[PDB]
Design a protein around this ligand. Structure first.
Ligand SMILES: [Mg+2]
Ligand SMILES: [Mg+2]
Ligand SMILES: [Zn+2]
Lengths: 99, 114, 144, 56, 158, 139
RNA sequence: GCGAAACAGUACCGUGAGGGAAAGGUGAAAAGAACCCAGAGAUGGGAGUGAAAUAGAUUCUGAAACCAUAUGCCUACAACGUGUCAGAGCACAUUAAUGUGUGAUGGCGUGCGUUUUGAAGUAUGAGCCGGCGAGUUAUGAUAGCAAGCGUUAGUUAACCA
RNA sequence: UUCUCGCAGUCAGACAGUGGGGGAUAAGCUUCAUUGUCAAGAGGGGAAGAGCCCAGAUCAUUAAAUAAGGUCCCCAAAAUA
RNA sequence: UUGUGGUAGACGAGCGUUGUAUUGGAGUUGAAGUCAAAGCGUGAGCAUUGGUGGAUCCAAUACAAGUGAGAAUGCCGGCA
């Protein structure tokens, strides 16, 4: 009914029909993707990893988070460097996970 | 030719002012103070973007130790029973969130007792 | 990004509690009272919503202080005037006002905060066994 | 003795919070219709039922 | 400049003991009366030099792209005549050859006066002598009508 | 249906007229003229006359109920100022400045008279967002 | 831009030599608001002319500092370089966006330029806003890059057309 | 890190360890030598500290393992003998 | 694969302004200037709609600079 999945370097706690945002996956919108890394699907602990168990997901959009306007200022010492950044995410929801 | 340059200065200070809203007093009115406040706010944001990932880890540690003390063992003993045997790569955010949906985390604490 | 962390909000549900300082020492009673008041033992501790239980103390004057602290360790308090340092000793404080002693030994261990002056009022230390807050139906537990 | 920092626009309003005004007690004169202020004579010439002045 | 505006040598203030800026003179560059400190001057040369051989090479090459770009229709001295001073017939010829929206250019040797009298009021067109045309005056045309003989003179000059 | 009334450059400070402007604002009409005529202040009569003028305006020109009127809005904006010099000790010549106020009054008829201004504000932002979403049809 | 677009060397200062400013724009054409109400009147509200009267003589455009008024949220046990990362509750709906407005509460948190070995500084400058305000030019020399012409090369100056 | 050429900036240094001169093995004193830091360096420890210890910050991440330093509560983490 | 802190400073790559020359274009069905908004870029910056305003302005390539403002107990004007 639940699951724990390792997307990117993060671990998520997903249930049926949950939209959770992960890093970029280079996948077109609508494709069924199988996040291979997994552990604790249902009362089953795969010690390093949970082998042969898969979770199937469909992605929803490729967006960009709110702008992080990072500016560093060495105080009173001639420095006003400026930079901007927009981390891209991929919003995807689960459909069904293989046992 | 002689150049006055009215639009550019107004646009620049307008952008700097707009970056700061909700500020107390004249900080949201005077550009000369608005720029300094924006600098300090961005410095604080840069510091807290690291502080928050430094701190949420401690928060998870606390809310995990509190749960573990109700089963008869401490957090420090727990990690060994994860690492040395019954090896797992379960993060501390989910080893903490799973308590919010219990009867499944107790499976974790009993599995390591083997 | 990742699963936004859960933090219970405005769902504070707290129960009263009873403990008798029969042979407790000051420090080990104070620490347990403080981290019970803070709600530190809760499985879901939201650090800004005051999820800590109430607490009533019984027989404060029966507390003990190890060693010779009763005649050597002084407690202090100052009014803003000059020479307002009111200095009292351990043995002197226990007979006259034991409740203030426990109150301060608990208030010191709480974080300098705004909830601190709201947590500290959730402790109701009594000198004798008889109290007036039995209307809340408090539970009882040993050495907390 | 001079201010060292600029007194802001907030402190000035806080000080002027008490500078508000108040209304004086008003009453309707008898034998004639007007709103004189209390315990005085109306412009109508009557203090209660008595002659104190000319028409106006 | 600061030294040319009608100003006062007097110091508007004293140097010290009156708390203001220094302000040695009234007509300083930062004042509102103003002596603009650097500005432009009317003695700037604005001129550049290009070597004669380089300029001849540029003229020759630009003639090379233009003369063989299927728009330099050869013209003759005959039709420079056969036209009155009227410019109506000129625009008639232009629309006949469909060159209304171009900038047609006439290079010539004898500088006939019937044509020069015409085409004067036509802003697009212009007639220039063989030695009066420059690189810009040629490559701007996008359409020109070289007349018959200047081909030999251009070959000689290369 | 505002039927307001204004006057330009009264010889009184805005801060000294706003004190009675606050006294009158929000009340009815009959209980306003007397309470304003009976105060001992310079700004009393200068606003009482303008209020009587506003009563006459709202009665004749716009033709409203009359007795249903009530002073809806009073303010005392900063009028143009006159900068004048003044002799001082040891010849320092500071500068006095004579303030002025552009007094206005507004007298509503219906009791609410506010959320419809917010309705016009929402109509403006509505037309802005509708014009924006219409411009998406560039395809 | 001449100091001076206008009744400028005027106003003004100085006994005198002398010093020496600021300031423009309704409208298409006054068609400059008859007449009514209030008010002593100025004036304001209607009406009328006008495409436009939020073009009305204060007369093109109208920003900020500053002052008022109001919709929504918060604030009277609170140690606050005023923000930031979290964070309810409350009210709404947008350049459809993991939305906006406010922010009870938690963690953290001693400005900006100067000159200094070292400044939050009990060093120094700025009350705020707006405008003006500081590496140019002439003629030379040196070096780099690129172009033209090239192995008895290259190249004009003044002047004339 | 050797040579040729273009363009610089610097000639007020401070502290810690170490070896000494002056000083009274007094000074956060003065002047050398040497290794480091700051100057021109953020972070963690040191309660708060430019000069001490572990270290060298391209940005984002609500991931993990460690260094100095620590594990009664503030303040994350420990027990056993 | 090696890296990517940085004052004095050395080098490179760019944005913006006003005008000029070539093409192209828009504009009383409303240009510029102005305000507002929950827009887009690594940054100088650049859009979109609505209100006001009523007549010039924008894009591409080069050239030319009286070309970029927080500080000078700066000047002037206005307001605290
Ligand atoms: Mg001071
Ligand atoms: Mg007062
Ligand atoms: Zn009467």
């Amino acid at each position: 009914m639940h699951a724990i999945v390792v997307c990117g370097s993060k671990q998520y706690l997903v249930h049926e029909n949950d939209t959770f945002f992960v890093e970029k996956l280079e996948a077109p919108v609508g494709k069924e993707i199988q996040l291979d890394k997994v552990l604790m699907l249902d009362e089953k602990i795969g010690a390093p990893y949970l082998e042969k168990a898969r979770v199937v997901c469909v992605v929803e959009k490729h967006g960009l988070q709110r702008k992080v306007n990072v500016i560093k200022h060495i105080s009173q010492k001639h420095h006003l460097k400026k930079y901007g950044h927009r981390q891209p995410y991929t919003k995807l929801k689960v459909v069904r996970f293989v046992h | 030719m002689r150049i006055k340059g009215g639009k550019q200065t107004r646009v620049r200070r307008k952008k700097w002012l707009k970056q700061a809203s909700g500020s107390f007093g004249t900080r949201h009115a005077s550009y000369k103070v608005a720029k300094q406040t924006v600098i300090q706010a961005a410095k604080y944001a840069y510091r807290d973007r690291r502080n928050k990932k430094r701190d949420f880890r401690s928060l998870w540690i606390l809310r995990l130790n509190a749960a573990l003390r109700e089963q008869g063992m401490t957090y420090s003993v727990f990690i060994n029973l994860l690492k040395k045997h019954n090896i797992e790569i379960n993060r501390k955010v989910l080893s903490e969130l799973a308590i919010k949906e219990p009867s499944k985390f107790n499976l974790i604490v009993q599995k390591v007792k083997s | 990004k990742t699963s936004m962390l859960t933090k219970e909000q405005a769902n504070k549900r707290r129960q009263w509690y009873i403990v008798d300082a029969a042979g407790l020492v000051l420090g080990k009673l104070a620490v347990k009272a403080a981290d019970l008041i803070r709600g530190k033992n809760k499985v879901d501790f939201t650090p800004n919503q005051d999820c800590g239980d109430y607490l009533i103390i019984i027989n404060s004057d029966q507390v003990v202080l190890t060693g010779n602290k009763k005649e050597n360790e002084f407690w202090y308090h100052h009014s803003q005037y000059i020479g307002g340092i009111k200095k009292v000793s351990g043995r002197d404080m226990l007979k006259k006002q034991s409740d203030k002693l426990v109150y301060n030994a608990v208030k010191g261990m709480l974080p300098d905060n705004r909830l601190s002056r709201r947590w500290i009022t959730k402790v109701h230390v009594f000198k004798g066994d008889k109290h007036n807050m039995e209307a809340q139906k408090p539970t009882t537990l040993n050495w907390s | 003795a001079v201010q060292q920092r600029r007194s802001s626009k907030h402190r000035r309003d806080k000080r002027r919070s008490h500078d508000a005004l108040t209304a004086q007690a008003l009453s309707v004169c008898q034998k004639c219709g007007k709103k004189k202020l209390f315990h005085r004579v109306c412009s109508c010439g009557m203090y209660g039922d008595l002659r104190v002045k000319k028409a106006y | 400049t600061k030294g040319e505006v009608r100003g006062g040598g007097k110091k508007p203030y004293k140097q010290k003991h009156t708390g203001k800026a220094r302000q040695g003179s009234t007509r300083n560059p930062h004042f509102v009366g103003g002596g603009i400190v650097f500005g432009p001057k009317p003695n700037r040369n604005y001129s550049l030099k290009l070597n004669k051989k380089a300029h001849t090479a540029a003229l020759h090459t630009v003639w090379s792209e233009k003369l063989a770009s299927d728009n330099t229709h050869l013209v003759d001295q005959n039709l420079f005549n056969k036209t009155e001073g009227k410019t109506k017939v000129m625009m008639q010829f232009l629309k006949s050859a469909k060159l209304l929206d171009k900038n047609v250019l006439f290079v010539v040797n004898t500088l006939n006066t019937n044509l020069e009298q015409s085409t004067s009021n036509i802003k697009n067109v212009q007639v220039k002598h063989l030695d009066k045309v420059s690189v810009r005056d040629l490559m701007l045309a996008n359409a020109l009508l070289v007349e018959k003989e200047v081909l030999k003179a251009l070959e000689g000059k290369f | 249906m505002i039927a307001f009334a204004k006057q330009f450059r009264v010889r009184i400070s805005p801060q000294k007229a706003r004190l009675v402007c606050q006294l009158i604002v929000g009340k009815k009409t009959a209980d306003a003229q007397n309470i304003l005529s009976n105060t001992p202040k310079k700004a009393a009569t200068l606003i009482a006359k303008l209020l009587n003028s506003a009563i006459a305006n709202a009665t004749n020109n716009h033709g409203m109920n009359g007795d249903a009127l009530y002073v809806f809005e009073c303010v005392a904006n900063q009028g143009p100022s006159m900068k004048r010099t003044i002799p001082r000790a040891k010849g320092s010549s500071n500068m006095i400045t004579k303030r002025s106020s552009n007094l206005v009054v507004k007298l509503s008829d219906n009791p609410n008279e506010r959320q419809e201004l917010i309705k016009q504000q929402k109509a403006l932002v509505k037309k802005r967002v509708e014009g924006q979403q219409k411009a998406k049809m560039a395809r």
